[PDB]
Structure formats: structure tokens, C-alpha cells
Symmetry: D2
Subunit: 268 residues, 4 copies
């Protein structure tokens, strides 16, 4: 009863109710997991968002660039879950890439300070979280990060794709570390999901050509997906994360599960 | 209650109690699936083997090279599961590669008749089964085949690796077909499992250098696996198959889940 | 002077003057290679085609399914090139997939006899040729086969994609064998080239939907290619084969060079 | 006469005479290319090193983290090569990863400031160089960066592997940009080369376990390589870079050529 029954799971990256992490949290709760959530900057907001989750979850502040947040995370979570209790699950659902770098908008014009911020938050923070959290994880545990397939360049996502390549590589190293703890580390490569940032982009937040490109990306995904892809539905990805959080992929680590409708297996 | 609760699942490829498919079947049953099994040539044997499964399952003959078996499969399974009932799950756990082709034993010396047999049974039969069975599958359904990662050549497995490359490619096409039915098609790439054939090979069935190579392959796997690999335990793979058979990887098709301890993410 | 100056190179697979192998041969000759050609069934035709090459080349019959052709190849080529002379280069530019299997036309409807023929000629023949020819190759030698990227399923090519997956896998094994001889074995993954068969397909030889699909494949290639792709020009692929035949990729084997305009690095 | 005859080629990353870029430069010169070299911090040293090249080459300072260096590069090179002359070739042979991050030495202990420096110099600088230099490149041009295969985690290289994953991803984006100029952008994934830094590491510069690991990596490479790998010889990689710099891989971009002895195609 419950895929995640009895599992304590930290889920980062809720910012709105359309956040992939919101759905992960909701599905994890539906599946019996006890959550601790982390949020970055707008904690009153995140608290209010997360109140809609089917169960209460302690919400902790984690700015993955901080250091002090990271240093105290583990302490703050064992406090939230009770001393002598450890994490079974950690969800990294964190990403960010500044400007220009990202849409439209010339790849070449992103200053390294921005790329570096993006990679910090989007890639390196995966190692950071695993470092902060593996000491309070149980054998049989699972770390899952949110990915998208960056093995081919694409329009618009630019430096964010680079950040995901870095992340996928970080993941395979976290796996090496996580393994000593009996902990899996895996990524879920999602197809495009109409998250608030994503609808803003397709709406022209980042320029016409950025939005046009993402819309094209979305349509081609779905077409390519042998089972289709619904970008308005984060649930198939929430669930895939949960499958990774579960004991049902026990021999899978340093790996990437594609929750993308199979689009990446296809070409056309 | 039960990952696979209420699911009707055909599981091929039980030949002994150390068959990966035996474990898949056992775990599937533990998880509430109702099975139909297929067996190839030694049905009295397979019946006797499968009696040890936690639940009875109708056993059907399927020689995947036959044609008549394939043509009548679907009819025979709807008979076994009851008219108006369809499959939710199909497990292809079938492989075979003759001689020389396979260990030791020169790759170049395998006649095409043997390679072709191997690919028939090991790769093409995946399309065959999906063809025979998709007409009696439910939307939300899942086809899983047993794979090993053939993206790099290795000693000993030779033509069988080629057969797995062909299979992985067949899988991505079955996905296209399966998708029209709302059915996923995926592969599980397992690490080496001490199946009876495999212990025979490491014992020198196919020559000293074949066995030496597989033993080396086994050790390097485990070392590479950030979570280790236990070749004597098919369970982590049974379970991964079940995860694919479940509704917990709903956005994954034409794909390969590596139940290999993460060895393939590693290098060294 | 001449990329391939002083190199003896066997080039298979000329059937017309729009054959990729015709261009390979022409470019190889322009680059100073001395060729031996093999042709399959229509040798008077192939002789007449190959007369247009900038230099004469002995033409040998090689039906890669034969066995006797294979057994006598090596003898027939050392005869053509002079005893005490060996091959430096071997070009496999051979492929074939029967019906239905290939366009339109249901993947599931290709009988294994056809798939097996396709894989024989398209994949296994790569091992066959390397087996026949490595005994008459020089250290520093190079075997190149013609590939297309089958890592993702696509419309229309179906079983031929499977055949290319098998081939890529065969290639990595031939590399292991070739290596003992100081010989590289590599594949060139070409984008779509308007070869006579290919224009026939886009013209509806294999049905409307087959042709529509290939045309779509062609356009998307070119769009995806950061340097574009001209399907009417086999030359960039001829040249890439030559680069592999040369001493300029000396540390590359079991590998695939994508002469595809970079389309495969792109997504969209 | 000369693979690179008449080509103007910028080659970065000479620091010693065992630098991969030194060999690239030497082979490029042997092949008729006219070089402009860039060097980072020790220009008197680099000048003295580069005096041993078979031909004189203007040496320009390029600290790829600078910005002003980048902004003025293009101007400084057109000055070195003569107004109305453009680059045909650009070689990025630049990498760096600080401490701990790199050997031994816990992956988790590298502060982001160090990782970010590493990625700046090792990955982002590839975009930087392409940005600075594409405006002074000729159609038919070629940008080549030095890579190693980071698709699997490995001991010791840690954050540097991540940096290479980022680089490979950067490369596929530079390809998109380079393409508008008729310029290819590709990476060469080299096996391990006993460069001065590398011998220092295997000598214990970074700790015993770092050196042990690299030595193991080196041996396994060579064993895996169907044509062997000689880590003391950068020439097969110099040459592969040259092949990319040449017109002989005209349809290859956003891509990675493995000059690794085929080790990456192998497993074991
Ligand atoms: N379409 C998508 O929404 C998408 C999302 N993801 C991943 O899902 C994860 C969650 O993203 P989301 O839910 O879409 O976006 P979101 O904006 O809801 O969440 C991102 C989260 O990151 C958090 N964050 C930002 N900075 C920090 C910081 N310093 N410290 C802590 N937290 C911080 C932020 O608070 C927010 O909660 C990210 O890793 C995504 O990159 C992965 C892939 C896709 C997808 O982008 C895609 C893209 C291109 N091709 C195919 C598929
Ligand atoms: N070590 C392993 O045992 C191994 C097994 N698998 C897959 O698991 C599946 C089951 O294999 P197993 O359980 O090991 O072996 P098994 O001998 O128990 O089962 C193979 C089954 O195929 C059946 N079969 C043979 N011919 C026919 C036919 N004409 N019609 C119907 N059925 C037929 C046969 O009856 C038997 O039940 C096969 O696809 C394997 O290739 C996949 C990978 C690995 C693994 O090999 C590996 C290999 C190399 N590197 C890494 C990992
Ligand atoms: N578009 C293309 O033309 C294409 C061609 N190639 C490869 O290039 C090689 C040459 O093909 P081609 O020049 O297009 O076609 P072709 O018809 O000119 O040559 C095929 C050759 O195979 C020969 N052959 C057939 N049967 C036998 C036999 N029993 N023994 C000996 N020879 C035999 C036949 O005589 C002919 O000379 C084949 O391996 C192709 O698959 C590889 C890829 C592509 C490309 O197909 C593509 C496809 C899908 N996505 C992307 C790119
Ligand atoms: N073994 C190797 O030496 C190796 C080298 N490469 C690449 O070859 C390229 C050259 O490296 P190398 O010749 O070995 O080392 P090197 O120390 O000779 O050259 C690195 C160059 O980078 C330069 N550099 C550093 N910082 C800056 C800066 N701010 N601005 C401008 N230049 C700067 C530095 O001056 C030096 O000339 C780098 O991209 C390497 O990463 C790629 C792969 C391998 C290989 O590492 C390997 C590794 C793991 N698995 C398999 C193979």
C-alpha cells in the first residue's frame, strides 16, 4: 500500500503549484511518503503553495548556492524528521539559467557569470545536495534529480542544456559517492512541461523566437513520443520520480530515466 | 497493495528456476499480477519449474520461431485469461545464440545460419511477440524485453551482443507500434546473472577463454557498479521489469532501463 | 599528394553512378588510391558504371551472401593487386532490406526470412568482408562500412534501421579482430543521399506514406544539420570515408563517423 | 601536398612540448598550415617552447577567462595573419580544473568557485573562442576542441569529467553558431596522454589514490583499445585534430571524434 510507504523524502524545488516538484511531492504523499520540503527564497509563498499537498510537510529553506544552508541542512532535516530517523529519498527539482544565456538569445552573449550561476544551481547543487544529505540517508535510499536530455543541442534552452549535460555528468559521480551509502542517484529526463516559466517563455517572455522554438520543440515532442507527450501533465514525471524513489528500480544508479513519452528514442 | 495488482501479464522465457523470467514471474506474482507463461520446447519441465511460483499460471507453448505458435498466441492467451480480458503486460525474456558464434570462439566463424537463428529468437521475436500480443493488450499496457547493454563490444558474447543491439533497435520500433495501443515497449538491460547457461559458460562449457572472459566481465561489473552487482541475484532485475510492467514508468517507451548496478554509467 | 596515395583499397557496393560507393571510389581514386572493386549480381552493368571512374579498377564479383565468393575473395584480390601486395583499405558500401519490411509498410509484417536477408547483407556481411579480407590487409589498414544512425527509430527504414544497429554492433567486434592486424574498422553514418533506390522510395516505390516519411526525414535533416545537408551530394560522405581510409584518423576504431551534416548532434 | 596546405590555423593551449596542442601545432605545420598560437600566462616560456615547432608562428596571449583578451583576439590575429586574411582552423586545447576537485580527492569537497573556474576554462572558453573567432573565419572552416569521453564517470578526473560533459554540450551549440559561417565545430576525445600534468598526477602530485586510478585508467585503455593506446604518443590525436581541421570531414559537426584507440567502443 503506497509505492513510497514509510519513506522519508526530501523534495526541493517547489516554487508554484505547477512546479514539477509540486507534482512529485503530491504523488510521493499519495504514495505514502513522508516529506520534508525545501524552498529557496519565497518561503511564505512556498508554504502557501505546499499547503495544497495532500499532507503537511515541514518546509525548510535551501538556497543551494548558500553554503550555510547546505551546511545546516541535514541538521535541519533530522530535526524535521526526528533524531534517529534518516532520509530514504531526496529530490532535486532545481534549475535556473539567467540572461541573455537561455532564450532567445545568443548563446555567445551569455556572460560566464550567468552560465556559472546556472550551472551552480542546476548541476553543481545536485552534488551539494547529495553531499549535505547522504550522511542522513538510509541504505536502499534514492536521490533523484530532474533532468532533460541534453545529448543533442536544441534551440532556446542553450546554456540550460549545457547545465543539464553537466548535471547528468554530476549525477554519475554522485552515484559513486551515493553507492557507499547504499544510495542510488538517478536523473529523470522529462519532456517539456508547461510550468509557469515555460508558459512564460512560450508566451514571449524571452522573445518571439525563443517562444516559437519551444512551441516547436513541444509539438515535435508528442509527435515523436510513441505514447505522446502531454506538456500540461507533470504527473507521468512525478510518478517516474516516485518509481526511482521506490525500491522498484534497485539496480539503477548514475542513470537517467526518460519520462519523455519515449520521444528521445525516436528521431521522427 | 501489489505493484502489479490486477494486471494480467504474459511472461516468456522460463526454462529453469534460475531463469531471469522465473524471477520476473515470481516477483510479478508477489506483486499481484496474474500470469500466463509461455515456454518453448520442454513444457513438462517448464510446468514442473513453474509449479514453484507463488501462484498457478497457465503455461502456453511458444516457440518464437514457429509462426503457427505466434499466430495462435493471443487466441490461446485470451482462452487462458478469459474472453473479454486482455493483457496488461508482456515479458520477453528470450534469448539464444548457437555456435561457434558466442564463446570462445571466433566471432568470424559463426555462420550466418547461426547468427540468424540467434537474432530471430533474441531480437526479431520481440517484434513477433509484440505483433501477436498487442491486439490483446490494454491501453496503459507494458511490453518488457530482457536486454544487456551492447553499445560496446565485449569478449565472449559476440553475436549475442549484436543480437541485443538489433533488439534494442527492434524495441524502439515496437514502441512505435505499441504506442497506438497505449502500450509501452521497453527493455531491461541487466548485468550478468548466474543463470544456468551462464554458470556453464564460466565453468568452461564454451571453452576456457570464454569462461575467463565472462568471469572478468562479472568482476569488472560490481567493481564498476556504484551499488555493486550481485550476479547470483536476479531479483533487482525482476523488480525493474516489474517497475516497467507497473504504471510507475508511464512516460517511458522505446527505452532501456539499466538494471545493472549502474555499471554502465561508470567506465572504471 | 593524394590523401590515399599508394593505398590499395577494395570498394564494394557500386551498383549505379549515384551509389555512395561510386563516389567513395571516385574520391579515393582522385586521392591516389588504387582500387579493386567488387560488385554483386550485375557485373557487366557495374563494369560499365565503373568505367566512368577516373581510373581503371579491377572489378571482382562479390555476393556477400555467397560463401564461395567470400572464400575466394582475398585470392581474387591478391591476383588483381599482385602477389606480395596487400589491401590498405576495404569499403563496405552494401545494404539491402526486402519487403514488406522497409516502407511503407508494417514493421510487424516483414517475415523473418526477409529481415534475415537484410541483416545478412547489411550487417553480417561486414564481418564476412573483414574475415575474407583482414588476412590480406596491411598494418595501418582501414575497413570502413556505410552506416546510418539507428540509435533512434524513425519512419520507413524500419528493419533497415535494425540492420544498421546490428552493423554498428558488428563493427565494434570487427574492430577487435581488425586490431590484431593493425587494422581499423569504422563506420560512416551518412545522412540521406538521393541514391536511385532512395529517389524511387521518395517517388512512391514503396508507397505514399513511405515516400512522404523519407521526404520529411530529408527536410528535417538539413534543418537540423548546423552545416546543412545536401542529399543530392554523396561527396562529403565519400570524403569522410576517405578520411577514415587515410592515416589521418589513426586512433579511431570500432567507431562511427557521422557524415550527416551534424544533424545527429541536434534534436531540432 | 599537406593535409592542411594553405590553411591558417589558430592553436591554443601550448604550455609545454608535451602539450597535446604542441603536437597538434607540429603536425598542422608539417601538413602545411600556417599557425597563429595563443598562450595563456607564461608567454616567454611558450615562445621558447614553440620555437621548436617546424615553422615560426606568431604567439598571442589568450587568457580565456580574461574578456579583454577575447575582445581583442580576432583583431590581434588578423594583425598576425594579415588584414583580408581569415582563419580556416581554430584549435581549443585548453583545460584546467583546480583543487580539491580533481584527484584524489573528494568530488564533494570541490568548492563551486573551483568547479566554476574549471568549467570556465575547460568548457565555456570553447564558446568564447568560437565567439571571438568565427567573425574572422572562412567558410569551410573548422573549430576543434580537445575532449575526453565523459559519458561515464571514472575515478580521479571528477569535476574535469563534468567540465568535459559541459564542453561536449557547448560544442553542439557552437556547431549551431559555427554553421552560419560555414564553419564546423567538433571535439576530439583523446585517450589519456602522458602530458606533464598527467605524469605528475600518476607520480602522486594529487595523492596516491589519484595516481593509482589514472594508471589503472591508462592500462585499461590500451587493453580495451582494439588498436592499443600509447599514452606517450600524442601524435595519433594531433593527426585526428588535423583530420578535423582538414576538408576531409566536411559533413561532421557538433560532433566528437574519438582518438582513443577505439577504447570507448569496447567495455572490456
Ligand atoms: N519543461 C520543464 O519544465 C522541465 C523541467 N525540468 C526540471 O525540473 C526541475 C524543476 O523545474 P520546474 O518545476 O520546471 O521549474 P520551477 O521554476 O517550478 O522549479 C525550479 C525550482 O528551482 C528552484 N531554485 C532556483 N534557484 C534555486 C536556488 N538557488 N536554490 C534552491 N532552489 C532554487 C526554484 O525555487 C524552483 O522551485 C528543474 O531541474 C528542471 O530543469 C527538466 C526538464 C524540463 C524540460 O525542460 C525540457 C526542456 C527541454 N527539453 C525537454 C524537456
Ligand atoms: N547474464 C544473463 O543471464 C543475461 C540475461 N539477459 C536476458 O534475459 C533473458 C532471459 O535469459 P536468461 O534467463 O539468462 O536465460 P534462460 O536460458 O533462463 O532463458 C532464455 C529463455 O529463452 C528461451 N528460448 C530460447 N529459444 C526460444 C524459442 N525459440 N522460443 C521461445 N523461447 C525460447 C528459453 O526457453 C529460455 O527460457 C534473455 O533475453 C537474456 O539475454 C540479458 C542479459 C544478461 C546478461 O547476459 C549480460 C550479458 C552480457 N553483459 C551484461 C549482462
Ligand atoms: N540515403 C542513403 O542512400 C544511405 C546509404 N547508406 C549506406 O551506403 C551503403 C551503400 O548504399 P547506397 O549507395 O545508398 O545504395 P546502392 O543501392 O547504390 O548500393 C547498395 C549496394 O549494396 C549492394 N548489395 C546488395 N546486395 C548485395 C549482396 N548480396 N552482395 C554484395 N553487394 C550487395 C548492391 O549491389 C549495391 O551496390 C549502404 O550500406 C547504405 O545503407 C547509409 C545511409 C544512407 C541513409 O540511408 C540514411 C538513411 C536513414 N537515415 C539517414 C541516412
Ligand atoms: N590525458 C590528457 O592529457 C588529456 C588531454 N585532453 C585535452 O587536451 C587539451 C590540452 O590538454 P593537455 O595538452 O593535456 O594539457 P596542457 O597542460 O599541456 O595544456 C592545457 C592548456 O590549457 C591552457 N590553459 C589553462 N588555463 C588557461 C586559460 N585561462 N586561458 C588559456 N589557456 C589556458 C594551459 O596554458 C595549457 O596550455 C585539454 O582540453 C585536455 O583536457 C583531453 C583528454 C585527455 C585525457 O585527459 C583523458 C582523460 C581522461 N580519460 C581519457 C582521456
Amino acid at each position: 500500500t503506497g509505492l513510497l510507504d514509510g519513506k522519508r523524502i526530501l523534495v526541493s524545488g517547489i516554487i508554484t503549484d505547477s512546479s514539477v516538484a509540486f507534482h512529485i511531492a503530491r504523488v510521493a504523499q499519495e504514495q505514502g511518503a513522508q516529506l520534508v520540503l525545501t524552498g529557496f527564497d519565497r518561503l511564505r509563498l512556498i508554504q502557501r503553495i505546499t499547503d495544497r499537498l495532500p499532507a503537511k510537510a515541514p518546509l525548510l529553506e535551501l538556497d543551494v548556492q548558500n553554503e550555510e544552508h547546505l551546511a545546516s541542512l541535514a541538521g535541519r532535516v533530522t530535526e524535521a524528521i526526528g533524531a534517529g530517523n534518516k532520509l530514504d529519498g531526496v529530490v532535486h527539482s532545481i534549475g535556473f539559467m539567467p540572461q541573455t544565456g537561455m532564450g532567445i538569445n545568443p548563446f555567445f552573449d551569455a556572460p560566464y557569470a550567468d552560465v556559472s550561476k546556472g550551472i551552480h544551481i542546476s548541476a553543481y547543487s545536485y552534488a551539494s545536495m547529495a553531499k549535505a544529505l547522504l550522511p542522513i540517508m538510509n541504505p536502499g535510499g534514492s536521490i533523484v534529480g530532474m533532468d532533460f536530455d541534453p545529448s543533442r543541442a536544441m534551440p532556446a534552452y542553450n546554456w540550460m542544456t549545457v547545465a543539464k549535460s553537466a548535471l547528468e555528468s554530476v549525477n554519475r559521480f554522485v552515484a559513486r559517492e551515493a553507492g557507499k551509502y547504499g544510495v542510488r542517484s538517478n536523473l529523470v529526463a522529462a519532456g517539456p512541461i508547461r510550468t509557469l516559466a515555460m508558459s512564460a517563455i512560450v508566451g514571449g517572455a524571452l522573445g518571439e523566437e525563443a517562444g516559437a522554438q519551444i512551441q516547436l520543440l513541444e509539438e515535435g515532442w508528442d509527435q515523436r513520443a510513441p505514447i505522446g507527450w502531454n506538456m500540461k501533465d507533470a504527473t507521468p514525471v512525478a510518478k517516474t520520480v516516485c518509481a526511482l524513489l521506490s525500491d522498484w528500480l534497485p539496480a539503477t544508479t548514475g542513470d537517467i530515466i526518460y519520462a519523455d513519452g519515449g520521444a528521445h528514442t525516436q528521431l521522427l
